[PDB]
Amino acid sequence: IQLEYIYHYEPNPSSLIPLLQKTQETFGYLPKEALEEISRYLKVPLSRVYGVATFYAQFRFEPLGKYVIKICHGTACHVNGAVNISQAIREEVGIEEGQTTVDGLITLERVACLGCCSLAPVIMINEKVYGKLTPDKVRKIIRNLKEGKL
Amino acid sequence: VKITVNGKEFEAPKDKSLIEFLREITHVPGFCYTEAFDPYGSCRLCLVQTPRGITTSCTLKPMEGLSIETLSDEIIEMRKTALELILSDHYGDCIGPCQNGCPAHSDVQGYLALIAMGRYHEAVKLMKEKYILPAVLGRVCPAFCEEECRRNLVEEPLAIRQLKRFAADYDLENGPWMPEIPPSTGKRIAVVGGGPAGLACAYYLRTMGHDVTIFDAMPHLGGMMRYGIPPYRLPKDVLDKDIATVINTGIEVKTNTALGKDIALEELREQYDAVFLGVGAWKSRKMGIEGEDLDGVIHGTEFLRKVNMGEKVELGKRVIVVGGGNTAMDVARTALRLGADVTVVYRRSKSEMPANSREVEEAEEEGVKFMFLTNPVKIIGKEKVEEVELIKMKLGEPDASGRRRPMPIEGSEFRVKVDNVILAIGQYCDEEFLRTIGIEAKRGRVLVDEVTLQTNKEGVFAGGDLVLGPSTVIESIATGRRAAIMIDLYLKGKLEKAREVLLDPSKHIEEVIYDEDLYRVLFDLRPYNHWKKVTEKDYEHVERKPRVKVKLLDPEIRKSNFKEVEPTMDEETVLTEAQRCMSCGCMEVFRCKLREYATLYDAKQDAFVGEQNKFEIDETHPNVVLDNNKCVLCGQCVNFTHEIAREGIVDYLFRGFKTYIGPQLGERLEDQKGVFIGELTDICPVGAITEKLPFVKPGPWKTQPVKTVCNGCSFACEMNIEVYNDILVRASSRKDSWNGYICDYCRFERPWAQDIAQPILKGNAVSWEDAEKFLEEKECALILTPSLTNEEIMFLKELAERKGIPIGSTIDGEGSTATLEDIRNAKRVLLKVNIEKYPLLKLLLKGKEIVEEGYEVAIIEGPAEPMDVPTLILHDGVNATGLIKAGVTGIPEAKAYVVIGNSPAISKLKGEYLILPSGLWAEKEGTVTNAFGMDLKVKKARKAHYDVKSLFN
Amino acid sequence: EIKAIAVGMNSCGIAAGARETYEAVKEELEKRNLDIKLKIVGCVGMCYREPLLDIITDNEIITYGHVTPDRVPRIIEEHVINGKPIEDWVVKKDWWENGQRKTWDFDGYFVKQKKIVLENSGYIDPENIEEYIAAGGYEALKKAFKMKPEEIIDFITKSGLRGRGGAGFPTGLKWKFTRDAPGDEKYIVCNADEGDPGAFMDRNVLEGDPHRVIEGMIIGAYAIGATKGFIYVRAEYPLAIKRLRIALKQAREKGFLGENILGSGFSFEIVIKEGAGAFVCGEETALIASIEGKRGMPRPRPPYPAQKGLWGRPTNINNVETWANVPWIIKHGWEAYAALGTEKSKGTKVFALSGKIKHGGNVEVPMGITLREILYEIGGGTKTGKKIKAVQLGGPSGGCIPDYLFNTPVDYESVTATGAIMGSGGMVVMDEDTCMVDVAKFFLDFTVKESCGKCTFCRLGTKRMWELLDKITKGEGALEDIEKLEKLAPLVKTGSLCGLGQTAPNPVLTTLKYFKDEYLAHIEGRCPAKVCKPLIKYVIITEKCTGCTACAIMCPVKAIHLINQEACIKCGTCYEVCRFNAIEITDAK
Numbered sequence A: 001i002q003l004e005y006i007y008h009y010e011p012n013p014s015s016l017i018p019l020l021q022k023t024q025e026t027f028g029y030l031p032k033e034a035l036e037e038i039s040r041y042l043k044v045p046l047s048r049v050y051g052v053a054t055f056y057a058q059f060r061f062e063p064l065g066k067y068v069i070k071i072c073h074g075t076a077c078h079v080n081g082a083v084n085i086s087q088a089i090r091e092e093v094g095i096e097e098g099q100t101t102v103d104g105l106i107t108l109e110r111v112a113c114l115g116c117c118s119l120a121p122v123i124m125i126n127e128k129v130y131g132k133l134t135p136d137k138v139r140k141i142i143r144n145l146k147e148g149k150l
Numbered sequence B: 001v002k003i004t005v006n007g008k009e010f011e012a013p014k015d016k017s018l019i020e021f022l023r024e025i026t027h028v029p030g031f032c033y034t035e036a037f038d039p040y041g042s043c044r045l046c047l048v049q050t051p052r053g054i055t056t057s058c059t060l061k062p063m064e065g066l067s068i069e070t071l072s073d074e075i076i077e078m079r080k081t082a083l084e085l086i087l088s089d090h091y092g093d094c095i096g097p098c099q100n101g102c103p104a105h106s107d108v109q110g111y112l113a114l115i116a117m118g119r120y121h122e123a124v125k126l127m128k129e130k131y132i133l134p135a136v137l138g139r140v141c142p143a144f145c146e147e148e149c150r151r152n153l154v155e156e157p158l159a160i161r162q163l164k165r166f167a168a169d170y171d172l173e174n175g176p177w178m179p180e181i182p183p184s185t186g187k188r189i190a191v192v193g194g195g196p197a198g199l200a201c202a203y204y205l206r207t208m209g210h211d212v213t214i215f216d217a218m219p220h221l222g223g224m225m226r227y228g229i230p231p232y233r234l235p236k237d238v239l240d241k242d243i244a245t246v247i248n249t250g251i252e253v254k255t256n257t258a259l260g261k262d263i264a265l266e267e268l269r270e271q272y273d274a275v276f277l278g279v280g281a282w283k284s285r286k287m288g289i290e291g292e293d294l295d296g297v298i299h300g301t302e303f304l305r306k307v308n309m310g311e312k313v314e315l316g317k318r319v320i321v322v323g324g325g326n327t328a329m330d331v332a333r334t335a336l337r338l339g340a341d342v343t344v345v346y347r348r349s350k351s352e353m354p355a356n357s358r359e360v361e362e363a364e365e366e367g368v369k370f371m372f373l374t375n376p377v378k379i380i381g382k383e384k385v386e387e388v389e390l391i392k393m394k395l396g397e398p399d400a401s402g403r404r405r406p407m408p409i410e411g412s413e414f415r416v417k418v419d420n421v422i423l424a425i426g427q428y429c430d431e432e433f434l435r436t437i438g439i440e441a442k443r444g445r446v447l448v449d450e451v452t453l454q455t456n457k458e459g460v461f462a463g464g465d466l467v468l469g470p471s472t473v474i475e476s477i478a479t480g481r482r483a484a485i486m487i488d489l490y491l492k493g494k495l496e497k498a499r500e501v502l503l504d505p506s507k508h509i510e511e512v513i514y515d516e517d518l519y520r521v522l523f524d525l526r527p528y529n530h531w532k533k534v535t536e537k538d539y540e541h542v543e544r545k546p547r548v549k550v551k552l553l554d555p556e557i558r559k560s561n562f563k564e565v566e567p568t569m570d571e572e573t574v575l576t577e578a579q580r581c582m583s584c585g586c587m588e589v590f591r592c593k594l595r596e597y598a599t600l601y602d603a604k605q606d607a608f609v610g611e612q613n614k615f616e617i618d619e620t621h622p623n624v625v626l627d628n629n630k631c632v633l634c635g636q637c638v639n640f641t642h643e644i645a646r647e648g649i650v651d652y653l654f655r656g657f658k659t660y661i662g663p664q665l666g667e668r669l670e671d672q673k674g675v676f677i678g679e680l681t682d683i684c685p686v687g688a689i690t691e692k693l694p695f696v697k698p699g700p701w702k703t704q705p706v707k708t709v710c711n712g713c714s715f716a717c718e719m720n721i722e723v724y725n726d727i728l729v730r731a732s733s734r735k736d737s738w739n740g741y742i743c744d745y746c747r748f749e750r751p752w753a754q755d756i757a758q759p760i761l762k763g764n765a766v767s768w769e770d771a772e773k774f775l776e777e778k779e780c781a782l783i784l785t786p787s788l789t790n791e792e793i794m795f796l797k798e799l800a801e802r803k804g805i806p807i808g809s810t811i812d813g814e815g816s817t818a819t820l821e822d823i824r825n826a827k828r829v830l831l832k833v834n835i836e837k838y839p840l841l842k843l844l845l846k847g848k849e850i851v852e853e854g855y856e857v858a859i860i861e862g863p864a865e866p867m868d869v870p871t872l873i874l875h876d877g878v879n880a881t882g883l884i885k886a887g888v889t890g891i892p893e894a895k896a897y898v899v900i901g902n903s904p905a906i907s908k909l910k911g912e913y914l915i916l917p918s919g920l921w922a923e924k925e926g927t928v929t930n931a932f933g934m935d936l937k938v939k940k941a942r943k944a945h946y947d948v949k950s951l952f953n
Numbered sequence C: 001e002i003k004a005i006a007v008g009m010n011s012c013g014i015a016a017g018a019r020e021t022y023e024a025v026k027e028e029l030e031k032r033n034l035d036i037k038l039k040i041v042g043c044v045g046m047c048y049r050e051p052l053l054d055i056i057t058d059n060e061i062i063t064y065g066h067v068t069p070d071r072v073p074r075i076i077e078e079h080v081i082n083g084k085p086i087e088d089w090v091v092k093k094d095w096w097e098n099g100q101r102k103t104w105d106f107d108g109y110f111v112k113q114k115k116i117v118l119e120n121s122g123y124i125d126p127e128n129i130e131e132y133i134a135a136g137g138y139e140a141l142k143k144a145f146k147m148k149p150e151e152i153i154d155f156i157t158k159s160g161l162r163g164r165g166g167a168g169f170p171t172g173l174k175w176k177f178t179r180d181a182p183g184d185e186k187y188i189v190c191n192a193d194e195g196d197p198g199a200f201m202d203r204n205v206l207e208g209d210p211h212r213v214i215e216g217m218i219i220g221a222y223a224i225g226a227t228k229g230f231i232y233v234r235a236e237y238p239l240a241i242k243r244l245r246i247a248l249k250q251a252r253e254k255g256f257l258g259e260n261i262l263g264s265g266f267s268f269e270i271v272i273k274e275g276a277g278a279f280v281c282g283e284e285t286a287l288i289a290s291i292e293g294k295r296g297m298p299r300p301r302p303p304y305p306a307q308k309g310l311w312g313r314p315t316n317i318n319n320v321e322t323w324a325n326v327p328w329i330i331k332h333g334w335e336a337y338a339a340l341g342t343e344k345s346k347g348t349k350v351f352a353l354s355g356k357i358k359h360g361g362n363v364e365v366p367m368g369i370t371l372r373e374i375l376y377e378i379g380g381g382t383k384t385g386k387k388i389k390a391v392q393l394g395g396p397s398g399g400c401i402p403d404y405l406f407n408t409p410v411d412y413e414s415v416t417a418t419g420a421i422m423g424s425g426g427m428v429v430m431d432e433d434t435c436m437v438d439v440a441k442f443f444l445d446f447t448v449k450e451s452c453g454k455c456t457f458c459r460l461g462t463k464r465m466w467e468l469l470d471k472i473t474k475g476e477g478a479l480e481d482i483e484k485l486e487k488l489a490p491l492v493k494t495g496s497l498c499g500l501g502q503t504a505p506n507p508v509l510t511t512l513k514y515f516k517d518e519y520l521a522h523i524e525g526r527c528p529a530k531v532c533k534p535l536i537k538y539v540i541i542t543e544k545c546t547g548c549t550a551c552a553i554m555c556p557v558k559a560i561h562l563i564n565q566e567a568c569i570k571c572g573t574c575y576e577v578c579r580f581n582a583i584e585i586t587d588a589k
């Protein structure tokens, strides 16, 4: 079935976080049934599993959209105008950061750093980096993304 | 190891944490440290000053030459800031707003809960911790508590005054409650003034031990309750009963003894240790306008004193009363009842009328005419009053926010034809009498220090209307109680220190914790009460319940006589009205560590203001409430439930400011399986986790722990029973117990509060006459159940030996051979029992190996024989091991059986049964023997109405 | 003859368009029927000049900058076939004299740089262990296997190597504490959980040269006695994880990892633990709890990780940069390492020049170089010639150093004195267009997000400090807010349990210390840098306006010759697309 991956991992409590990462790879999020089978296999309380899963910002309990927009709010991007580009993205898309659109097209996320601090205003859309972003340019990129291009 | 704490030399254990030793020698705050867990650094309140810097003492290990300052300025500031940070995210009320509205700060919630239970004597006992005349207050108080009530935000405030009147009259009728007087302190206090303030000072100084003498000018005690308050509001038989309850405590009354005429203040100081001046304001203020000397200008207090004393009062047909206080209203209604057409003139509006509003509405019904914003300017007549000149007034400028002052409207002068003018514009004490005795007063009101209530003379205190001017009975009783507190502090030498502590307790914390009196006074007079800003939107979920209406006497009939206009409520409406309380106060207010620390460190709630985390209360569980709004995030519940109980009921959720405690997302506490859910109520330090109590209203009471054992099984776990005047509130966990924790069976099933009332014969309850007949007729072999203490077993065994009756017990086998050390040290165990039926085995066997071969200790369920390895034989009766030790095993053979205790497996027995009750476990005293062979003591929570010893004779 | 063509394929290169350039090079080599070796390299450090294409002759390397796909045919035709370098695009030259590589660059970026950790990055193929062997690698591993483990510890403690991930605890002492601890099973951890928002040096080492970290870990494990090694890298760094897995496979199959490593009887295995992502999990105790499957909540220090760490067994947790320094110390000697840097801080430090600096990238500077040299000779100053107001050193944990204190040498104590810390190695340059209150608010916002919420001081005081900063920024502040900040920040520093909260008030403290005039100007309702949204008003200059209306079709809120102040979203796109001096950001007063 879908939950076969759990038994490849060692039934020690230390395997929880790798198992959570494997679950979020397999399903895109953390389902309840998978979490209870993880708690059963590792013999850890389900409250411990939920505390670990809610501690880390990687894990979410609802599936992600098609286009994931990652706004870098590191120091280099912030001093070069990350607030203005996030304002442009939020105003064009219509959701705040950390939310999914109702149709599930655009998921908006905030990330720490992407390594390209020289392209200081930088976002990432599905592992593709767009850099040197004035608010107008990122509005153009969002509008071109919405119409099925890119 | 030698460490230096605040300059002194100390020897401490090396392995143990420093916080334990420091809390042994001094006071160290801290939420999150429990010795069963490793040190946790979450509360950050146990800070000490080391040579390296400021660090937490729960993590430090005692080292050689370590010097630690526990109370320095920086440490006080750091703890204060930490407490203010915690309070900035705290949501809840320590006390209900009813207690803050009462000038005497009475536990309104507690005695309303006691009234809802039907315990009126206990409710009056709780009332008398803050005031002394609950019937008088139920009749005449302006009900400041009902103004502040949180029921004002939903429908209608609780009838606190009328419920208090009902309970107080029940106590006066069905036997009055009198307090306990401690041994004499050897001190004498002179009290001047037989009014409510003097009575309160005398009562609360008598309840401390000092011998009190009351001096009063009038022939009777009561003051303006007897000579100023009319008898249609306060009947004098009720006043006599209430004052009798105050005076029967041992107060020496000297009536018809005045100050300045019979005894001077200097003689009073030389003969008595402290003197309280509550002479009251018995002079009436003149108006100063010309013509005030005309015949027909009576003063309100003199007129009401003549009417109350029965003296001949001459009154005309038209009477004008000037003033707007309670004095004016009583003058107006008394003059209406004597036969006069009464008009009351007040210089302000109706809203700013100081009078009791219920009395004003009653007077408007009875036909008293009011004209507000009017002021008399002149009284016109040859020798007697014929007419009075009045000027219309308007509100003036707001000035320095002084609620404006009435300024006359020029040209609006009008004349009213009247026969008598009664002056009720205010009261004061005689200024010349105050100069005769030497007390510093301004405008006739005595100047006293606001904290200590002390005059310019040493040993002289003041209160009542002498200090507050025209005031209330409850405010006078508050001043009297505070003066009793301050007189007791003055007689020990601690008054100056206490005043400094009450001004700023954060600078004298060492003296506060070192002195019992300073701690008590600080927590009585300046406690930290946490508040929430609630509007009407926060009580929309509450059921709308109507307030009780008491049928007043007919206005047309009551305008002619001096019969009491308001009766007492009927007893059927009392419970219905008392059950409307929303119990706004915190259930943990008497044991919450956060409130105590905020009291000691002078923490303000508004020091840091921002956004708080808003949570919904999780009260779906039948017995336990979880309130994350009162969670200080110490982690003790998580540490217990994951590292000691292994149940994992709750855990930390989310990160940072959004962190809270709860089950897995999508489930509440009702879905969580665990027999140690109720231990979290004792684990929590502040009151985020609380227990639902099996009473109608759970209102927090000052319960006293009682050390006893549980009767759920052979473990006989040590516990505290929380008792409040014969009420078995809850079972809690002792720290000094061999088990430390108790299960949800003991807490929530309460086997210690269970007893069958009457003997059962063949499945039907019978009276004791039938039991005596059965005992006399049949052979009645004696079968003992394991619910009896060791002394009872000895008594029953000796009775059987003396009389020859065959004796046995339902329990058979041999006792356990293992000790708690053996179970603690062994690692491979044989478990032939169900783990769920003996819940402490879950805690005792954590991490052990459950094997079937090569074991070290064995756990078997009785009846059984000891095995080769040290065995743990577990029965279902607490004193099963005591029965096995005394040698009363087996069921002997006979015709009919009398069994002492309703134990199961008695249906296996052959014949006919007489089940005699064994009694309440909580009402029992003696020792028991539990599974591990310990002899554990049982103590009485309350007096026993049944004993098995006298039943058998 | 052109031996090889190399394209920089780090995360910074990949983001700039290095995949497109690499594929264009492959297409051009295939089209021209050329037989040159196409290899990938890491990052040399010129992140501002990327994508970088290196043409490797046997004796010289010619590195071209800004190599887009369309520039590739020109470069290929003119250089690899005709043989004429295009000197306009040549940004870097490397030549060998007496076995030491010498560097020339257009910008003088490398002049003040001594590369100890990044000596191989941008020259070797990170996915080919043969290239790293040919560059002198893993010779230090054989040399360390020759000597005794305690001799290795003495070598490390005599070089003055201090921890590059934090406070700078001496590494030899840490190794000795892990070796002297009682126990038969011990672990080592490589901390690659760089949670600093502005730090990219650790992933730079793990992507451009992972075998350096692997070799350092093996040397340290031999010295300490560890059986298992953990590389704690985030799952947000997939390229680093991929290259680490490739490198681990190649080192295992060649006998450097496994059982009986090079005949020493020493069994060592390295396993990559993927961190889920939290700034607090970079803390030692939180990292231990995260590997063990718990929440990343730190615990008090008197039980130290070097004596009771992973599952109770002793653990040595060191940074990627420290492990990368170890092979250089073993190969070149401890005296060579002690011949660099100040008296107390030895060696070299890797900094990340970011923000408003012109030559941003990864710099390898010796300890004791002055801050002004890094900011002006290596960084080139600001990108528009403006003055530098301050630098943020240490990320959110460190503080702002102003321009009159730029003479401070970058050693541990000289930076600790000013109220900053060396921290991760992040250097963010702030200019005249930067509001220091906004910077402090950003750092406190990050701290509020990343706190684990265990101790009362961090969890509550960071939120209260951030609320005070937001109050001051919105203009609704007063002097009492500044006094509350000045009282609260030292207490949050003194009372917090872990280093996140103990370094949390550092930005606020430093900004108050050096830039209190900006705070007092925000009390009066004005932003001297025109950054805060409510304190700035976008005003239109009518006398300097034009009828072309360039800043009229780009505005999405429709607040434009006249500005609708009641409807302005305050994005600021007017000031850039106007291509004329008409829009002026002015105080709303």
Ligand SMILES: Cc1cc2nc3c(=O)[nH]c(=O)nc-3n(C[C@H](O)[C@H](O)[C@H](O)COP(=O)(O)OP(=O)(O)OC[C@H]3O[C@@H](n4cnc5c(N)ncnc54)[C@H](O)[C@@H]3O)c2cc1C
Pocket: B140, B141, B142, B192, B193, B194, B195, B196, B197, B198, B215, B216, B217, B218, B220, B221, B222, B223, B224, B225, B228, B229, B230, B233, B257, B258, B259, B260, B278, B279, B280, B281, B282, B301, B304, B326, B327, B328, B330, B331, B356, B359, B463, B464, B465, B466, B470, B471, B472, B473, B474, B476, B477
């Ligand atoms: C007309 C009237 C109506 C009121 N109605 C209400 C009401 O409806 N509700 C309400 O809550 N309160 C009412 N009050 C207030 C009520 O009287 C309060 O209890 C009052 O504040 C009592 O103050 P006290 O403690 O000073 O006692 P007092 O009543 O002032 O007692 C004074 C006592 O001191 C004695 N004394 C006086 N001078 C000397 C002296 N020189 N030496 C020795 N003894 C002396 C007097 O004989 C008397 O026993 C009313 C008061 C008045 C006057």
Ligand SMILES: Cc1cc2nc3c(=O)[nH]c(=O)nc-3n(C[C@H](O)[C@H](O)[C@H](O)COP(=O)(O)O)c2cc1C
Pocket: C162, C163, C164, C165, C166, C167, C168, C169, C174, C191, C192, C193, C194, C195, C196, C279, C280, C281, C282, C283, C284, C285, C317, C318, C319, C320, C322, C498, C499, C500
């Ligand atoms: C909040 C916080 C984040 C940290 N992040 C890192 C990190 O990303 N990388 C790192 O090497 N050390 C980090 N540290 C420091 C570690 O706790 C520890 O000191 C470090 O691993 C020691 O490295 P060293 O052996 O080279 O001295 C962090 C510390 C704190 C308090």
Ligand code: SF4
Pocket: B090, B091, B092, B093, B094, B530, B586, B587, B588, B589, B592, B593, B594, B595, B630, B686, B687, B688
């Ligand atoms: S938890 Fe403590 S401090 Fe908070 S409201 Fe309840 S009693 Fe007061």
Ligand code: SF4
Pocket: B101, B102, B103, B104, B105, B106, B108, B131, B137, B141, B142, B143, B144, B145, B146, B160, B161, B164, B474
């Ligand atoms: S004395 Fe008055 S204010 Fe106080 S509780 Fe009783 S009725 Fe309420």
Ligand code: SF4
Pocket: B096, B097, B098, B099, B108, B109, B112, B148, B149, B150, B151, B158, B160, B580, B581, B582, B583, B584, B585
């Ligand atoms: S509802 Fe009860 S507890 Fe709350 S204010 Fe009213 S009387 Fe007090």
Ligand code: SF4
Pocket: B630, B631, B632, B633, B634, B635, B636, B637, B638, B661, B683, B684, B685, B686, B687, B688, B689
């Ligand atoms: S619920 Fe109580 S015990 Fe648990 S963390 Fe909160 S305050 Fe502490």
Ligand code: SF4
Pocket: B710, B711, B712, B713, B714, B715, B716, B717, B741, B742, B743, B744, B745, B746, B838, B839, B840
């Ligand atoms: S384990 Fe048995 S004796 Fe102990 S508390 Fe529970 S029911 Fe009572």
Ligand code: SF4
Pocket: C280, C297, C298, C450, C451, C452, C453, C454, C455, C456, C458, C459, C496, C497, C498, C499, C500, C501, C502
């Ligand atoms: S300082 Fe912050 S991150 Fe560190 S333990 Fe305390 S609350 Fe957690």
Ligand code: SF4
Pocket: C540, C544, C545, C546, C547, C548, C549, C550, C551, C552, C561, C577, C578, C579, C580, C581, C582, C583
């Ligand atoms: S602001 Fe500039 S672009 Fe806009 S209308 Fe004026 S001149 Fe034209």
Ligand code: SF4
Pocket: C538, C554, C555, C556, C557, C558, C559, C560, C563, C567, C568, C569, C570, C571, C572, C573, C574, C575
């Ligand atoms: S600043 Fe932005 S929102 Fe305001 S007018 Fe210009 S483009 Fe429009």
Ligand code: FES
Pocket: A072, A073, A074, A075, A076, A077, A112, A113, A114, A115, A116, A117, A120, A122, C197, C198
């Ligand atoms: S700060 Fe955003 S890419 Fe580095």
Ligand code: FES
Pocket: B019, B029, B030, B031, B032, B033, B040, B041, B042, B043, B044, B045, B046, B056, B057, B058, B059
């Ligand atoms: S920090 Fe020591 S008791 Fe909480």
Ligand SMILES: [Zn+2]
Pocket: C010, C012, C013, C043, C044, C045, C046, C047, C050, C361
């Ligand atoms: Zn780069």
Ligand SMILES: [Zn+2]
Pocket: C435, C436, C437, C438, C522, C526, C527, C528, C529, C530, C531, C532
């Ligand atoms: Zn600003």
